[PDB]
């Protein structure tokens, strides 16, 4: 584990795991720093790799941070999964209960009206 | 196929196929008539059964009804079925819309939250 | 177990558990279901027995119920046994403190009290 | 077929397919995705070329993305196909009716009247 703050050609602040091996540098769990107490926003927002791939030539400064930045980030980075682990189970247990209630509607049918409903799922 | 209304002892009309094999009758798909056109009521919204068996010294009159009122059972009874058959097609498509784009978000995991989400599964 | 939904001649809808042995049929837990969701009330609320015996012949129809009607049941079964356990559990406790806080009132009494308490007691 | 986003020194964001062959790659069809659901954007608003070649200096992170946000170009690039063919069907019809009925309304002219359309077009 390593996490070191850096500052992008853009101009913003990059939060995250970090593993330099050849000069191109791998980040994980990458963050974005607003200015604002401190908050942090996903940086890539449009992706679900786990890992993302830059190279040292686009990035100015790469520096440890210090205690209570690491604290609010691994709080924030906890809460996250938790979320998502919540979520995940919501999801289960609707699509389980959808499932046996129209499991349970379509049992009371008869049989033309079930070959329909295999015509039509045909269709 | 036989459609004979009938008059109940409690003084309800009741149109639906029937068969009278030894005093007691079998009743399929009935319908309760309410005088009011004409309107039509499940008879037992409580059961999924086909068929219903009762006892002929429960029934005041059966008598074959007019066209009109034929027509317009067959009418209700094939829009019935047409609906259920459309409800199944939708809760079908709602369901497996949801279990993929569950799959979706639960592929973008890590190890330890993959255990800690078999864990909870588990508990 | 047998739970089984039966309409009587009077007109309203029992569920509960029924046991049919010769004609004659035994219902115990019988509920009322009034039509309004569902909503379910005491079918004898006069009475403290678990078992009421009735004849065939007042009954129209027997016919097992739905899947979502007997979880209902099944719920308000058990949260009224609960409520039940509960009051028992409070009225006990109400009797305890009741029984203790007398008891050390009557300690702290004369000879000629006492006396005076046996007398009255006994008229 | 290869659909990998980007994300450019400017600091836009960019889908589209995608051939990385000699460190300079080549990109068709790509779209520019602003932050705001999701909205594409066309690139380059001014060329009709297919393919445009950058240098692989100029980009940050070249990353897969989500499976929603593959859908919705998918959809986006076969909608803007369908309203160009639909629009080259609507000017092929009103040109033909246009030609047409310029023909007729020639048809009808003077020998004199000919000799001076003729001159003034060549003119
Ligand atoms: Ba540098
Ligand atoms: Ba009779
Ligand atoms: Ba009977
Ligand atoms: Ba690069």
Same mark, same amino acid.
């Given at each position: 584990?390593?996490?070191?703050?850096?500052?992008?050609?853009?101009?913003?602040?990059?939060?995250?795991?970090?593993?330099?091996?050849?000069?191109?540098?791998?980040?994980?769990?990458?963050?974005?720093?607003? @200015?604002?107490?401190?908050?942090?926003? @996903?940086?890539? @927002?449009?992706?679900?790799?786990?890992?993302?791939?830059?190279?040292?030539?686009?990035?100015?400064?790469?520096?440890?941070?210090?205690?209570?930045?690491?604290?609010?980030?691994?709080?924030?980075?906890?809460?996250?999964?938790?979320?998502?682990?919540?979520?995940?189970?919501?999801?289960?247990?609707?699509?389980?209960?959808?499932?046996?209630?129209?499991?349970?509607?379509?049992?009371?049918?008869?049989?033309?009206?079930?070959?329909?409903?295999?015509?039509?799922?045909?269709?």
């Amino acid at each position: 584990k390593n996490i070191k703050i850096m500052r992008l050609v853009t101009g913003e602040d990059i939060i995250g795991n970090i593993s330099e091996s050849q000069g191109l540098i791998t980040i994980k769990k990458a963050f974005v720093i607003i @200015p604002m107490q401190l908050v942090l926003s @996903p940086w890539q @927002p449009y992706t679900d790799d786990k890992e993302i791939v830059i190279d040292d030539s686009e990035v100015i400064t790469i520096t440890s941070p210090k205690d209570d930045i690491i604290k609010s980030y691994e709080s924030h980075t906890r809460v996250l999964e938790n979320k998502q682990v919540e979520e995940i189970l919501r999801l289960e247990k609707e699509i389980e209960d959808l499932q046996r209630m129209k499991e349970q509607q379509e049992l009371s049918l008869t049989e033309a009206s079930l070959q329909k409903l295999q015509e039509r799922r045909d269709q």
